[PDB]
Amino acid sequence: TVPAQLQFSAKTLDGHDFHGESLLGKPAVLWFWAPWCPTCQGEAPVVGQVAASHPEVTFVGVAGLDQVPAMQEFVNKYPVKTFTQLADTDGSVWANFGVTQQPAYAFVDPHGNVDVVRGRMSQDELTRRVTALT
């Protein structure tokens, strides 16, 4: 059965429906960010680089604590348009992972195991954690 952590739905920044269950059976990384967060602005290029280097992993940005326009500005300014971005304006996705503050990362292995890391992450650590999922 699906892990309760993946039982959520959301809307992508570009108007598509997203189902957390679509991540079951594959490695995935959810990156929780806020447009106004300087730390997220700094980590954006890093997450984008790791996402590009690991096409086997489904990266999902989860934007919160602001409205769509601010989220679009962030995605336009930093290189993270290559992977799915969720507009979590109602904060339900963050709540589902127990995330109250950004930045944060949720690592999902193919078995559905979920590990949440709160705080910043270097390119090396993200790379190593992503590799561990496979």
Q: Of the candidates 33, 121, 107, which has an alpha carbon nearest to the alpha carbon of residue 75?
A: 33
The whole-angstrom separation of Cα 29 and Cα 131 is 11
Which residues form the domain of 5?
A: 1-134
Q: Do 24 and 2 meet the contact criterion of CB atoms below 8 Å apart?
A: yes
Q: In Å, what resolution does this model reach?
A: 1.6
**Structure determined via:** X-ray
Q: Of the candidates 67, 93, 78, 79, which has an alpha carbon nearest to the alpha carbon of residue 13?
A: 67
Matching residue, tokens 């993200």? 126
Q: What is the CATH number of the domain that holds 7?
A: 3.40.30.10
The whole-angstrom separation of Cα 49 and Cα 95 is 27
Give the number of domains in the chain: 1
